[PDB]
Amino acid sequence: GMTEYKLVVVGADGVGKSALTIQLIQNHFVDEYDPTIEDSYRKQVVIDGETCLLDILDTAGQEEYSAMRDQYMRTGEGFLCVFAINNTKSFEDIHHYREQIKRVKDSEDVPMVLVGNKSDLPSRTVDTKQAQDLARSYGIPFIETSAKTRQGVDDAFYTLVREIRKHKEK
Ligand SMILES: CCN(c1nc(OC[C@@]23CCCN2C[C@H](F)C3)nc2c(F)c(-c3ccc(F)c4sc(N)c(C#N)c34)c(C(F)(F)F)cc12)[C@H]1CCN(C(=O)OC)C1
Ligand SMILES: Nc1nc2c(ncn2[C@@H]2O[C@H](COP(=O)(O)OP(=O)(O)O)[C@@H](O)[C@H]2O)c(=O)[nH]1
Numbered sequence: 001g002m003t004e005y006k007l008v009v010v011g012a013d014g015v016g017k018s019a020l021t022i023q024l025i026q027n028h029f030v031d032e033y034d035p036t037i038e039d040s041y042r043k044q045v046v047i048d049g050e051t052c053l054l055d056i057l058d059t060a061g062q063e064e065y066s067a068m069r070d071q072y073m074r075t076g077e078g079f080l081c082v083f084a085i086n087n088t089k090s091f092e093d094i095h096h097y098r099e100q101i102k103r104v105k106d107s108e109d110v111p112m113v114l115v116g117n118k119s120d121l122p123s124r125t126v127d128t129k130q131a132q133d134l135a136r137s138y139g140i141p142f143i144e145t146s147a148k149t150r151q152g153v154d155d156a157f158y159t160l161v162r163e164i165r166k167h168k169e170k
């Protein structure tokens, strides 16, 4: 049947993980979505001619490392590591999220895409060049998005799917 891809959106509180997921599916920008709601969403799309089903986990809640939390994140096939272009701390927190993904997946190679969100704001504090070069050192794609305007939203999620299937052919 149809290929299902399990996507997990990770990143600091307030970078726009919920706003990105809601934009991808409903095509609307939500200004205040409950920071505490973690939920799975579903969308069927065509990526490079393949019809597939996305199973997107929009993460929220507390940092905790129980066995059950670990195993849950371990079911994810690829990860959107989201920072905000106006929050340097959310960008420097990226190393941490990638390290946790690598730990539970028990692999140095895990399908991932780096997402710099809020590209519509005029006062950035992380340069594209800086994030591009970090992304290049990880060997992963980098995409700047806006959940306000939709710029880059489809490309971010679709490129993660590409990374997963390029990792499956191994
Ligand atoms: C949404 C929950 N969350 C998370 N915060 C943090 O760290 C927050 C900071 C702030 C200083 C202390 N700490 C360390 C670092 F300095 C950054 N790390 C998280 C994290 F690593 C994951 C994770 C990812 C991939 C995986 F394979 C696994 S496996 C497993 N057991 C995970 C866990 N947990 C996990 C997740 C998860 F699961 F949802 F994806 C959520 C995390 C909130 C807490 C408040 N936040 C914030 O931004 O506060 C300003 C973000
Ligand atoms: N201007 C702008 N604001 C955004 C963008 N994405 C999210 N936001 C806002 O940032 C705040 C937190 O976003 P949210 O989706 O809840 O982030 P989350 O905690 O990672 O799920 C909210 O006020 C959103 O409306 C964006 O691309 N541009």
Ligand SMILES: [Mg+2]
Pocket (backbone or CB within 6 Å): 017, 018, 019, 033, 034, 035, 036, 037, 058, 059, 060
């Ligand atoms: Mg949220």
